[PDB]
# Entry
Amino acid sequence: DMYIERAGDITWEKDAEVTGNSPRLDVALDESGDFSLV
Amino acid sequence: TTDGVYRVMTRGSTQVGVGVMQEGVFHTMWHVTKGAALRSGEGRLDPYWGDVKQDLVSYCGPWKLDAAWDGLSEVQLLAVPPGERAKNIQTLPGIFKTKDGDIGAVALDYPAGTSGSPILDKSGRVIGLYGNGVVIGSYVSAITQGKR
# Structure
């Protein structure tokens, strides 16, 4: 029994928390959908 | 059927992921559902398209989301963590550089049950889903978008 419940509208929020850095990474994507570093 | 962001639940109950309803199609990550049919109230949502390498699946119809990160602007993760109200987290993506081109990436680390949460541009368009990524020891998620 997998099921869904609505959680919200899809909207941008002006008052959003801001955080996180912006790394530049070399990666490879294999046949199984897995990313790895290169 | 209504447009919006949804929890994906399983049976006590556990939240295994998140997805996006748009234009009558439900969008989530393959690793969340493994393509299983989904219950919505008294109705059933059957898988329509899926791809393990993209880690994406759509239900009721073909993949509808086609906006893309512009490569310069901040975006918002509309995170729906287990047990928490949907909330917006604004960030500037970094980049996954691959042999086949660059993909935006967000260096945000939420519980696994947040996988499938949408990432939005300033217009409110879904530019991809959260939850397939790499570890650098912080997690970084690709901004994973399908093809319409």
About this structure: Chain B has two domains: 4-59, 75-142.
